[PDB]
Amino acid sequence: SIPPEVKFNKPFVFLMIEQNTKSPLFMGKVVNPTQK
Amino acid sequence: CGGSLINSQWVVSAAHCYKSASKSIVHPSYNSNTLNNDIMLIKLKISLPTSCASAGTQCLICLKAPILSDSSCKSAYPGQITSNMFCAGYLCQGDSGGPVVCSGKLQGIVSWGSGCAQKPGVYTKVCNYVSWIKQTIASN
Amino acid sequence: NKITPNLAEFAFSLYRQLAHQSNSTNIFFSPVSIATAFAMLSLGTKADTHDEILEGLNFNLTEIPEAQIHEGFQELLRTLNQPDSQLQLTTGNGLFLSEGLKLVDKFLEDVKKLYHSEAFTVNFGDTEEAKKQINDYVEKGTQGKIVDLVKELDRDTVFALVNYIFFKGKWERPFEVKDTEEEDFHVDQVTTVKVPMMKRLGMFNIQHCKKLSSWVLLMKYLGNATAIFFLPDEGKLQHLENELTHDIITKFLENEDRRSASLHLPKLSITGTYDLKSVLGQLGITKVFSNGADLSGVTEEAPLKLSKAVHKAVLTIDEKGTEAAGAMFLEAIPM
Numbered sequence: 032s033i034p035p036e037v038k039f040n041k042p043f044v045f046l047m048i049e050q051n052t053k054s055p056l057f058m059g060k061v062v063n064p065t066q067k
Numbered sequence: 068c069g070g071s072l073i074n075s076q077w078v079v080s081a082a083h084c085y086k087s088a089s090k091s092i093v094h095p096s097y098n099s100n101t102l103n104n105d106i107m108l109i110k111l112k113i114s115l116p117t118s119c120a121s122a123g124t125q126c127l128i129c130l131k132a133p134i135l136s137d138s139s140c141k142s143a144y145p146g147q148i149t150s151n152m153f154c155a156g157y158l159c160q161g162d163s164g165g166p167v168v169c170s171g172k173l174q175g176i177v178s179w180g181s182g183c184a185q186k187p188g189v190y191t192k193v194c195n196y197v198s199w200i201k202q203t204i205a206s207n
Numbered sequence: 208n209k210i211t212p213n214l215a216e217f218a219f220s221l222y223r224q225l226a227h228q229s230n231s232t233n234i235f236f237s238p239v240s241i242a243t244a245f246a247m248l249s250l251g252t253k254a255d256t257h258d259e260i261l262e263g264l265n266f267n268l269t270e271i272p273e274a275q276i277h278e279g280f281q282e283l284l285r286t287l288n289q290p291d292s293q294l295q296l297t298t299g300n301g302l303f304l305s306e307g308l309k310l311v312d313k314f315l316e317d318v319k320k321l322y323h324s325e326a327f328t329v330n331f332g333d334t335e336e337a338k339k340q341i342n343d344y345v346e347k348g349t350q351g352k353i354v355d356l357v358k359e360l361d362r363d364t365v366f367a368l369v370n371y372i373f374f375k376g377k378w379e380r381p382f383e384v385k386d387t388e389e390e391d392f393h394v395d396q397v398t399t400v401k402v403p404m405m406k407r408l409g410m411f412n413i414q415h416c417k418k419l420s421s422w423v424l425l426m427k428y429l430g431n432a433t434a435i436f437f438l439p440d441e442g443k444l445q446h447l448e449n450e451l452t453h454d455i456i457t458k459f460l461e462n463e464d465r466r467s468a469s470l471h472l473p474k475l476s477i478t479g480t481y482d483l484k485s486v487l488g489q490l491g492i493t494k495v496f497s498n499g500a501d502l503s504g505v506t507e508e509a510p511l512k513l514s515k516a517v518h519k520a521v522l523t524i525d526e527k528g529t530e531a532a533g534a535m536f537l538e539a540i541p542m
Contacts, residue, residue, distance in 0.1 A: 037457070063394045179497065
């Protein structure tokens with residue numbers, strides 16, 4: 032559709048990055064937001 | 068770690084516990100990566116064996132332990148056992164245990180570690196170094 | 208501002224190991240934290256136990272001089288601890304020594320200068336109490352997010368190496384709580400769970416890169432930090448995980464290309480707990496865990512070796528921003 036509908040409703044990868052150094056502070060993969 | 072007196076002045080132990088009395092003499096062919104020839108002599112200020120122990124033989128360390136076959140040994144710690152090592156245990160103590168004394172004779176010294184009673188240990192065959200040991204003590 | 212490409216490749220290497228370990232569990236860790244604990248430890252390490260470690264962190268020892276790697280961490284940590292007044296970001300390193308234990312003086316001065324490390328003395332003979340100290344250090348450091356780092360402390364422990372990283376940022380473009388509805392989340396072909404989905408109709412740094420077969424979203428935080436999210440296309444997760452490299456990330460970070468879109472991002476609260484010994488072994492770091500280890504650069508009193516390598520991290524994502532903490536626990540004992 033317009034605008035495109037982007038839903039993070041299935042497993043996804045993510046990265047937390049600091050701008051100055053460009054280094055990766057954190058990394059992860061969400062498979063089940065409720066896993067516990 | 069812990070050594071082992073073979074006479075009034077000389078104690079024999081593993082090479083790995085030292086540097087990464089009066090003098091130390093690590094085995095000239097000691098390999099710090101494979102722990103092959105992991106043995107050394109310390110001069111200050113049990114008895115050397117005459118035969119290589121074999122599967123089944125008794126021995127002690129408190130807590131007695133039998134010499135496992137090379138087959139078992141080689142395949143429980145694959146890729147880690149050289150021809151100068153043997154296993155002693157079953158099928159804790161914690162990597163820095165005492166020597167394997169089979170009948171008053173020093174048969175083995177800990178190299179990779181003393182396994183756990185709860186499911187073996189890996190030692191250096193002192194039997195294979197008696198010649199280098201006597202020669203070194205006799206000329207030092 | 209460098210050695211960064213190595214850290215990035217270290218993040219991906221370790222990620223692929225944790226992913227291979229389990230494909231049905233959430234994954235959350237901090238590269239910077241694991242990497243500096245091991246980098247700091249290589250300081251008192253010799254020969255090949257030393258090289259395995261540094262090469263295990265993706266460093267080519269023949270291309271970059273050892274002194275410069277440590278200078279890299281020294282600068283990296285200094286920069287991380289000086290964020291824009293709008294972002295909260297802190298890290299801490301701590302050595303826990305046992306009473307007595309004569310440490311090599313060069314080692315102590317190096318961790319102090321190159322890693323800005325703190326140093327404490329404790330009696331590991333009183334396990335429950337020493338365990339209490341380490342845990343409070345980490346707890347205060349991560350502002351309560353991580354309180355039980357050490358569950359088991361060995362009685363013969365000669366020294367412990369600990370570090371923590373804390374982060375708290377606000378979205379540059381927050382979500383509205385009243386817009387958060389509950390929607391489906393498809394864990395896999397057979398399971399579907401319901402979670403609070405945040406929504407926002409607007410302008411985003413988003414795009415569909417066919418090189419990764421997935422949509423890529425970048426959400427800035429107020430200050431000097433950004434969050435990157437990768438949504439793989441159907442059946443393309445494995446492809447995305449293997450195609451990630453430092454160069455690719457570098458490209459996304461240079462263009463602010465924006466566009467209209469309707470975004471659905473779930474709130475989160477996930478945690479990662481790990482025993483890194485085997486996973487690290489798979490990356491070539493094995494000697495420092497055996498009797499063939501050389502830590503003679505730390506102390507000459509006894510022949511030490513690494514007994515445990517524990518890592519813990521927690522994450523929280525809501526409509527205001529993100530909150531995260533990570534911690535590393537390295538225990539050493541006599542052979």
